[PDB]
Design a protein around this ligand. Sequence first.
Ligand SMILES: COc1cc(OC)c(/C=C2/C(=O)Nc3ccccc32)c(OC)c1
Length: 293
Amino acid sequence: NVVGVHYKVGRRIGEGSFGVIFEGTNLLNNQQVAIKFEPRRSDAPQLRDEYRTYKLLAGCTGIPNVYYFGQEGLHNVLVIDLLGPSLEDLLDLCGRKFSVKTVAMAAKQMLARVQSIHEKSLVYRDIKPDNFLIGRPNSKNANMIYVVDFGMVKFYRDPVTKQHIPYREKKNLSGTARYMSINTHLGREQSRRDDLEALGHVFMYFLRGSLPWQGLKAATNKQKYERIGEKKQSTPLRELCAGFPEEFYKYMHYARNLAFDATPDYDYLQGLFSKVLERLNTTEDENFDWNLL
Ligand SMILES: COc1cc(OC)c(/C=C2/C(=O)Nc3ccccc32)c(OC)c1
């Protein structure tokens, strides 16, 4: 039908670790939006709490604008800017893997996004390539990479005092295997380091086309997070980053080694990719592999 008083829904463009997303269209300007629906029940990670996060990060580079949030019957709606394909499809579309260049350039923006968030006293806690999108196909941001879905973001520090909160090693465990940090796997709580670490498992996913721990038999589901973690653990960073820019190794080695409160030297990490682009004689122009088709 039509919700958000002046936003009409279109087709389904996918779902996210939370709940379906349809691509609407504001009925008062003709601009294509993103509409997220969510039922009102046991769940309450409410687009609201996500809305509030889309609010906070609002104004920080590569963060989608928020446009609405209400209560339409059995649901909760959150209106958001439309955006291009996810880095995950792109990968698939670009031929199961990207090229050092493309990676290096993505890493920067990505890594930039995971910082902004951290500077808002929030761990992102759900780092996967499926969460990074590019501006709409033919616009002024097509060559930009955004972050989406903050359904798992948490406060790792009082946004005010910036005083870091606790450090357990005993709660739940309900994320996305393939890229989480080893800490995460071990039960440890997640700090800004866990975000940077999984980001590198993701950069190596791009380069390698896969990680060494994907696919694991003998288990089920609440156990797979084990076999995967183990392999991750029994997989040396040399072997993993083997045959790829040293910076990448340098990156992973850094991340996989920070303390639970360690404030990442974001500039150091950003510099590593800039060099990677310096060796290639290229520049941070957006010749991603995905603008040729
Ligand atoms: C992982 O689940 C999610 C992944 C998302 O983008 C890839 C989004 C946000 C999206 C968004 O803001 N625009 C889109 C256009 C197509 C598909 C998803 C989006 C989302 O809603 C917040 C949940």
